[PDB]
């Protein structure tokens, strides 16, 4: 079976600048002159759209600042200038001899300037607490970088192992993240307690944001 | 062209299953690709409709069996002794003749092998209060997948549908959020239409200011 490597796993890369994918093969994909060494990328939710197919041929409906390089075991995939919507992974193939196998893929993301989070809290519905659980839930919308702390502060105690975080893929317009984390209590454990709040550290705010409310009121 | 591939599946550990692929005049290679979450590509083999020619990955000669109907073009494979392992989204591609790549790509079918029972989700607003911000809380499916819409697909921009999570009752749960305008509140209605159909459940719930 012929393995693919892919290098670098991740990368970032500044809007209008290059990004430069390498996939090694441990065997020569080359036949008879041709090369059979295929690039896709992948979008969330989506499956994955040929790029580049024998290696430096250029796919249909795909933009030209996708290019492709390299025969025999070195192969190079470039994007100049990136845009915001090639945020994705890409995945190199080699089809020269069954089986048929991929690369462990490359997860490209834009860089952009740095955007502060708007952050909202919810208290629970009262139709979910007369079933005997309270989500508390806390948003945190259209940040950049990724890297954000959301601490639960309960009567301005910090809380550990009774939430969950979700964030969003990169966003392919405005290569913002969008975060959600959610406290979960029993309907008790939650009216032992009065004030709620999130407290939101990000590079992109001076000081810590805060989002409470009085359970009731 | 399209692949149209069957929905979700959930099947208990041992059992087994089948996936289809229906395309809709040539000679044409229908190959299938596995994809755990979050995970790589493995390729796990092709099928000639016209021939009934198989070619499988090694790794998969015991798990998967390839199998096409050429009177309406469909491609099928069987996976059998179903473990965690198994659990993944199953794409089917095709290969045109003198092509060495995939042209077209099915949607995907997801997997989940689980001894769980199917369950549907409850739904709960996450009320507002020049920006404001509401949405739902989908709370208590199994097994993936929910989708989720916003004023029957009128309502697109702004909306986020967080990846779900598994909780510590081992269902599944996500949130549904929109920033609107906030001198909208009054005015206009937010509806979110949830549709999970492994319980054949679909829920229309109003995100609205609480009283």
């Known amino acids: 079976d012929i393995v693919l490597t892919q290098s670098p796993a991740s990368l970032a890369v500044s809007l209008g600048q290059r990004a430069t994918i390498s996939c090694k093969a441990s065997?020569?994909?080359?036949?008879?002159?041709?090369?059979?060494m295929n690039w896709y990328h992948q979008k969330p939710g989506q499956p994955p759209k040929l790029l580049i197919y024998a290696a430096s041929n250029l796919d249909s409906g795909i933009p030209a600042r996708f290019s492709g390089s390299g025969s025999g075991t070195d192969f190079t995939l470039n994007i100049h200038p990136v845009e915001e919507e090639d945020a994705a992974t890409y995945y190199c193939?080699?089809?020269?001899?069954?089986?048929?196998?991929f690369g462990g893929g490359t997860k490209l993301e834009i860089k952009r300037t740095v955007a502060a989070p708007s952050v909202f809290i919810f208290p629970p519905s009262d139709e979910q607490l007369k079933s005997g659980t309270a989500s508390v839930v806390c948003l945190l919308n259209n940040f950049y970088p990724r890297e954000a702390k959301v601490q639960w502060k309960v009567d301005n105690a910090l809380q550990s192992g009774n939430s969950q975080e979700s964030v969003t893929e990169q966003d392919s317009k405005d290569s913002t993240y969008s975060l959600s984390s959610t406290l979960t209590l029993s309907k008790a454990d939650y009216e032992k307690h009065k004030v709620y709040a999130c407290e939101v550290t990000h590079q992109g705010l001076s000081s810590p944001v805060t989002k409470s409310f009085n359970r009731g009121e | 062209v399209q692949l149209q591939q069957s929905g979700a599946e959930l099947a208990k550990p041992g059992a087994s299953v089948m996936l289809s692929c229906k395309a809709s005049?040539?000679?044409?290679?229908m190959h299938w690709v596995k994809q755990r979450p979050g995970q790589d590509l493995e390729w796990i083999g092709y099928i000639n409709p016209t021939t009934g020619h198989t070619e499988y990955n090694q790794k998969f000669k015991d798990k998967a069996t390839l199998t096409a109907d050429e009177s309406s073009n469909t491609a099928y494979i069987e996976l059998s002794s179903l473990t965690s392992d198994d659990s993944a989204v199953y794409y089917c591609?095709?290969?045109?003749?003198?092509?060495?790549?995939?042209?077209?790509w099915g949607q995907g079918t997801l997997v989940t092998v689980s001894a769980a029972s199917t369950k549907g989700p409850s739904v709960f607003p996450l009320a507002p209060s020049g920006t404001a911000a509401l949405g739902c809380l989908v709370k208590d499916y199994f097994p993936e997948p929910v989708t989720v819409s916003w004023n029957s697909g009128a309502l697109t921009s702004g909306v986020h549908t967080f990846p779900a999570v598994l909780q510590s009752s081992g269902l599944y749960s996500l949130s549904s959020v929109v920033t609107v305008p906030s001198s909208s509140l009054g005015t206009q209605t937010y509806i979110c239409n949830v549709n999970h159909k492994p319980s054949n459940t679909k829920v229309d719930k109003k995100a609205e200011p609480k009283s």
């Open positions: 065997q020569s994909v080359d036949y008879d002159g041709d090369t059979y």
């Open positions: 193939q080699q089809t020269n001899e069954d089986p048929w196998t």
């Open positions: 591609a095709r290969q045109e003749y003198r092509h060495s790549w995939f042209a077209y």
């Open positions: 005049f040539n000679g044409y290679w």
